[PDB]
Curated annotation (Swiss-Prot), chains A, B:
Region feature Catalytic domain 1, mapped onto this chain: 1-434
Residues of the full protein shown: 181 to 614 of 1312
Protein name: Beta-N-acetylhexosaminidase
Domain of life: Bacteria
UniProt-annotated location(s): Secreted, Cell wall
Family: Belongs to the glycosyl hydrolase 20 family.
Length: 434, 434
């Protein structure tokens, strides 16, 4: 019961790269087939590729008109990557997609990323006429990150998240506000250290109250998300960066998507510390990542062979940076990313990744009852014309399928498959009365 | 088309007095029958008689626990009026009620009143330990009205409205924040004048920035309601009281429920001014009111005979205080109130009020197709055994009912009724083949 109760999630970066409703439905179908519970769909992640019917934003003592906001966002996304396959999902398409998934027992968790990975929102704010929304670091301007000192940019971003959270309310359960990799371009992947620096190295030009403002921003977004009955989620790397609790406290209702244990000079809080601070954790281990188009060994970081190795060697229970502690999880999430969004999306490769993750952690993933359900639909309804002996065999075989535990794991698939094979054999053995 | 497109609403004061799900369903059934579009259900109006499953409130740097909030509210409501029939509707009952109404094409519009008519919320705040939440006027303490200078009381109230608005989001369209009759007890029905007084009569002890704070409070509640995709509505009397626009501006997205033209020394803005300021208006004329238990002439203000006279003499298009202007309306609302909540609720009297309002404005109210639908269900399906002539008559008569305009008004009911009578006659005249 405890293993199957976990969430098993596939993540798709539909922020950087367009995915059609048709493609996303296929992913949902495989998710259901392999025993997953949720699709985690990034729609704001560098690009912004989801448009509400009403995009009007009220911030800064005014309202930015819906059609201007839409034009600004479409243009801003194209400035990031003008995808020949499409620009954005519409509200009708998203509503239908979420419905389609819900009918299959699959949840959807959106991401609209900020204050990093928000290239298109920054572009859009500039198109609307908001001044200098981007963060800069000693004359290097970030293309991806808002400046938390810019009240008008921050107000516009919060109102945009409020608008999206209102749409997702009641049809979803978790909203991922992101928070990963602050100003990774402008600071050469040292953004958290930069935000914390002035406290410890004053009078050197580091951003004043940088990290303090970041905590308040994270907490303000968590408040917005909670106000719509949704659980806020965020990536781990900026949450108590350098294990430093002295700047303030993150909202404990933020679920942590634990994706990285950090690296040389990128010293993240342990999952131990985060659990201790009262955060639930979704294991989003980068061991399992696939960046689209990096399709074999040698083709770069998070190539498909690397991801498949990570899946084979790092079980769903193995969370980044535990400090040897036993870290409880709400589930595991395998992620496909579109860092090079002009890469060809290969459904077979994504499905291979998804299948391997399910197979490697088979006790966690739901079994497939689809074919048992269909076999039951295909049984002849009326058996009177057949011999009593042969009829009994079919009725007992149907009864046996219907009696199967409805909570079997993928590890126990053969129990279901044997029961189907038995029914089919009895049906084949029906003998007409002489 | 324009008349039938209007909202036709019955209002029920289930704040002061308990109404069961069963009773409210009967009211919905009559509403549908008479051609109404909506039930306007006050649930916070002196008493507070609707409890969410999670009532935890975060305000004032803390959280008031759900069970403590529930206990505080139940007790606070009982302190206002301990109704032997019941205390509150639960979340499950409300969800079911709204569903029941939606299946009948009837919307539900809740009211949770503040900053007046909030006796039970004030009591509840005191039970939780919030200090001095009530407004006072020269040593007379209001039992019904929060003090807008009390930041902790105001913060708790706003968070309570946010919690209710979140529940009603997506299953309703309008949320009535009330705003009527500020401190009517403590000021002898002069509360708006008291809030405005200090601006014009300084150094006399009147509440400093009273009305300015009221505008900001109204606007803050409207912002909260809009954030959940709902349209905020409020009663007219405190909106530009004394036609004074100099204190600030009310949110134009507040629909005005225009209920009173005012009276001696109670000088409200005209509906002309409110329409000019950009507010849509729901005609809630007090001409049509019935206070439960005031059942005949001589039994007090808003007695049933008075209400029935008001219905006969004041059409749905006649809005209070027009200044002779032509005032557009979104619809009309007939209201039953429970000022003396120990009064016996008489469904027949409420239905008489509802019926008279529909009959007096018959071109506005939808016709009843229920009996036509049932007559069609009762037609014999198989007619082969009957003579060709008699069969043709039935088929033509069925076709005629099915061809009726689906947007007839109550004024045109006889067209539907004649078509039913014709079908029934043809069915009676079916003649078996010899
Ligand atoms: C939390 C996420 N942040 C980064 C994401 O933007 C990249 O696409 C991914 C693959 O390069 O790596 C990390 S995971
Ligand atoms: C807006 C509403 N405020 C008052 C309401 O509290 C009373 O029950 C009703 C009947 O006495 O009269 C007015 S209507
Ligand atoms: Mg809309
Ligand atoms: Mg650019
Ligand atoms: Mg909401
Ligand atoms: Mg709940
Ligand atoms: Mg009392
Ligand atoms: Mg809000």
């Amino acid at each position: 019961n405890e293993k199957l109760a976990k969430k098993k999630i596939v993540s798709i970066d539909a922020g950087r790269k367009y995915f059609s409703p048709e493609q996303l439905k296929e992913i949902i179908d495989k998710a259901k087939h392999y025993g997953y519970t949720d699709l985690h769909l990034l729609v704001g992640n560098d690009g912004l590729r989801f448009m509400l019917d009403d995009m009007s934003i009220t911030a800064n003592g005014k309202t930015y008109a819906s059609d201007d906001v839409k034009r600004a966002i479409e243009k801003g996304t194209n400035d990031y990557y003008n995808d020949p396959n499409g620009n954005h999902l519409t509200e009708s398409q998203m509503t239908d997609l979420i419905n389609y998934a819900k009918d299959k027992g699959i949840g959807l968790i959106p991401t609209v990323n900020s204050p990093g990975h928000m290239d298109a929102i920054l572009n859009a704010m500039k198109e609307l006429g908001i001044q200098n929304p981007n963060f800069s670091y000693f004359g290097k301007k970030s293309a991806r990150t808002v400046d938390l000192d810019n009240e008008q940019a921050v107000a516009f971003t919060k109102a945009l998240i409020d608008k999206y959270a209102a749409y997702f309310a009641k049809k979803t359960e978790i909203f991922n506000i992101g928070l990963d990799e602050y100003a990774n371009d402008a600071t050469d992947a040292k953004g958290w250290s930069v935000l914390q620096a002035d406290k410890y190295y004053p009078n050197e030009g580091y951003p004043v109250k940088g990290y303090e403002k970041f905590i308040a921003y994270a907490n303000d977004l968590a408040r917005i998300v909670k106000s719509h009955g949704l659980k806020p989620m965020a990536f781990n790397d900026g949450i108590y960066y350098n294990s430093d609790t002295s700047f303030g406290s993150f909202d404990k209702d933020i679920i942590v998507s634990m994706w990285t244990g950090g690296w040389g000079g990128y010293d993240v809080a342990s999952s131990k510390l985060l659990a201790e601070k009262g955060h639930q954790i979704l294991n989003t281990n980068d061991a399992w990542y696939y960046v689209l188009g990096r399709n074999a060994d040698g083709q770069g970081w998070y190539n498909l062979d690397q991801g498949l190795n990570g899946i084979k060697n790092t079980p769903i229970t193995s969370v980044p940076k535990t400090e040897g502690a036993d870290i409880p999880i709400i589930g595991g999430m395998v992620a496909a990313w579109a860092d090079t969004p002009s890469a060809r999306y290969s459904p077979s490769r994504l499905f291979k990744l998804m299948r391997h993750f399910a197979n490697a952690n088979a006790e966690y993933f739901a079994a497939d009852y689809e074919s048992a359900e269909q076999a039951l639909n295909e049984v002849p309804k009326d058996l009177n014309r057949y011999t009593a002996e042969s009829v009994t065999a079919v009725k007992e075989a149907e009864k046996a399928i219907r009696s199967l535990d409805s909570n079997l794991s993928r590890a126990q698939q053969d129990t279901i498959d044997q029961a189907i094979a038995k029914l089919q054999e009895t049906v084949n053995n029906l003998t007409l009365t002489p």
